[PDB]
């Protein structure tokens, strides 16, 4: 019985030097992301809505235009909800589908349902349009390097549907897409033909982004089994900073601070965490001031903070995949 599922326990990053770091910082464009990946997603997109359909087409189209060999799958299912049975569709974008191991980045593309109020519409800018856009900008920025993948380890992106409760949170009303996908992955043999390993055993680490985009985010070190990766985020943030590659940034106001947070946060990582998947959680604590409010809009986003996190995330991914 091969011990490949244990390889993630010992995987070490291939650290980028200064020159490569400047290259990555210069390779990403916050303005390009803003216009081409984020704005099209700032629309009402709760499950089953026209906006949900449009967001999916946007996410799919932006990935399909890239050179790397992304395999796109739409995972569609029915679930009971407070409003009766409804259909949901997770979007999975995978490089090297038969690769045994994958580093996984994830977020949710649905927006929380609210009836229009005073002609205001909830578009969930930090929740989670920006994370969706950061993942698309990461695919774009690193396209040339990812193309070379065409450790038996690759990259996967998941855009969950139905993360949000239709009413207020309850065990049965929330995480529709991730509860569904986690059980499906746990019961799908991997790699193809495998006798006793599942897609879940194949997930090296789930990097989950949500509620990102507000000013001064502080991300705590949530879990001991991914602490050494949280430390790499800190090391990367620190070096990008020292090299003068971040904007409007200081170490005292650093994003990754090593304080723990013991409580549970309800988001898409939960169904995976509870089945044994190591999670690196990029959800700040406290949550943005505009959380679940009509003010979670474009106007309240912090552009240089998103740009800074894009650089950190991209360096982290390259170092993880040895690219
Ligand atoms: Zn939310």
From Swiss-Prot:
GO biological process, one term: protein modification process
Effect of residue 266 to L: Lowers activity by approximately 35%
Annotated consequence of substituting residue 287 to A: Greatly lowers activity
Entry coiled-coil feature ranges: none
Keywords assigned by UniProt, alphabetized: Acyltransferase, Disulfide bond, Glycoprotein, Metal-binding, Secreted, Signal, Transferase, Zinc
UniProt-reported outcome of changing residue 210 to A: Reduces activity by 99%
GO molecular function: glutaminyl-peptide cyclotransferase activity; zinc ion binding
Subcellular localization, as worded in the UniProt entry: Secreted
Residues at which Zn(2+) binds: 127, 164, 292
Effect ascribed to mutating residue 22 to W: Lowers activity by approximately 30%
Active site: 163, 210
InterPro entries xrefs: M28_QC (IPR037457), Peptidase_M28 (IPR007484), QC/QCL (IPR040234)
Glycosylation sites: 17, 258
Cystine pairings recorded for this chain: 107-132
Annotated catalysed reactions: N-terminal L-glutaminyl-[peptide] = N-terminal 5-oxo-L-prolyl-[peptide] + NH4(+)
SUPFAM superfamilies, per the entry: Zn-dependent exopeptidases (SSF53187)
EC number from the UniProt entry: 2.3.2.5
Source species, domain of life: Eukaryota
EC class: transferase
One Gene Ontology term, aspect cellular component: extracellular exosome
Record-linked Gene3D superfamilies: Zn peptidases
Record-stated family: Belongs to the glutaminyl-peptide cyclotransferase family.
General function of this protein: Responsible for the biosynthesis of pyroglutamyl peptides. Has a bias against acidic and tryptophan residues adjacent to the N-terminal glutaminyl residue and a lack of importance of chain length after the second residue. Also catalyzes N-terminal pyroglutamate formation. May be involved in the N-terminal pyroglutamate formation of several amyloid-related plaque-forming peptides.
Protein name per UniProt: Glutaminyl-peptide cyclotransferase
Organism: Homo sapiens (Human)
The organism's taxonomic lineage, starting at the top: Eukaryota, Metazoa, Chordata, Craniata, Vertebrata
């Amino acid at each position: 019985a091969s011990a490949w599922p244990e390889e993630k326990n010992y995987h070490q990053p291939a650290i980028l030097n200064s020159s490569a770091l400047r290259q990555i910082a210069e390779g990403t464009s916050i303005s390009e992301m803003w216009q081409n990946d984020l704005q099209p997603l700032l629309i009402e997109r709760y499950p089953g809505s026209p906006g949900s359909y449009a967001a999916r087409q946007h996410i799919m189209q932006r990935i399909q235009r890239l050179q790397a060999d992304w395999v796109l799958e739409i995972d569609t299912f029915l679930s009971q909800t407070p409003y009766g049975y409804r259909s949901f569709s997770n979007i999975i974008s995978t490089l090297n589908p038969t690769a045994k191991r994958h580093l996984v980045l994830a977020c949710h593309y649905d927006s929380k349902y609210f009836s229009h109020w005073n002609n205001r519409v909830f578009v969930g800018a930090t929740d989670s349009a920006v994370p969706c856009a950061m993942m698309l900008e990461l695919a774009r920025a690193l396209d040339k390097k990812l193309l070379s993948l065409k450790p038996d380890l690759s990259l996967q992106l998941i855009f969950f549907d139905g993360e949000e409760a239709f009413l207020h949170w309850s065990p049965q009303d929330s995480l529709y897409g991730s509860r569904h996908l986690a059980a499906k992955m746990a019961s799908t043999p991997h790699p193809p033909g495998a006798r006793g390993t599942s897609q879940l055993h194949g997930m090296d680490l789930l990097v989950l982004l949500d509620l990102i985009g507000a000013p001064n985010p502080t991300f705590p070190n949530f879990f001991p089994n991914s602490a050494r990766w949280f430390e790499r985020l800190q090391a990367i943030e620190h070096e990008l900073h020292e090299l003068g590659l971040l904007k409007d940034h200081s170490l005292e106001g650093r994003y990754f601070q090593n304080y723990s947070y013991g409580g549970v946060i309800q988001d898409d990582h939960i169904p995976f965490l509870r089945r044994g998947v190591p999670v690196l959680l990029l959800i700040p604590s406290p949550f943005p001031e505009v959380w679940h409010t009509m003010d979670d809009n474009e106007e309240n986003l912090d552009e240089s903070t998103i740009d800074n996190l894009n650089k950190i995330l991209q360096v982290f991914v390259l170092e993880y995949l040895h690219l």
